[PDB]
Every structure is written in C-alpha cells, then in structure tokens.
C-alpha cells in the first residue's frame, strides 16, 4: 500500500509510476511511503 504525505506528493508519485518505476523509487523521489498493511497513518493521509 502506498501512502503520501501530501496531495502534490501523491500527484508526483502517480506520474513517477507512469513509466513503470518501482514504487520504492517513486517513494524516495516524492516522500511517499510503502507499507505492508492497508491503513495509512494520519501524517501520510494522501
């Protein structure tokens, strides 16, 4: 599950993913995160 700290981080994440970039790289590129669960925390609400 991906969680993002802000809307713009998420928007940048989704663009990063368009070419097929691994989520882990899109995460460090944006400040988004990968968690094993499905429940994003309040500070990664987007």
Swiss-Prot record:
Disulfide bonds join 3-40, 4-32, 16-26. The keyword Secreted applies. It is found in: Secreted. GO terms for biological process: defense response. One of its GO terms (cellular component) is extracellular region. InterPro entries: Thionin (IPR001010), Thionin-like_sf (IPR036391). Keywords: Disulfide bond, Plant defense, Secreted. The function of this hydrophobic plant seed protein is not known. Two isoforms exists, a major form PL (shown here) and a minor form SI. Belongs to the plant thionin (TC 1.C.44) family. This is Crambin. It comes from Crambe hispanica subsp. abyssinica.
């Amino acid at each position: 599950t991906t969680c993002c700290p802000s809307i713009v981080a998420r928007s940048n994440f989704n663009v990063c993913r368009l070419p097929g970039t691994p989520e882990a790289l899109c995460a460090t590129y944006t400040g988004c995160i990968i968690i094993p669960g499905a429940t994003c925390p309040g500070d990664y609400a987007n």
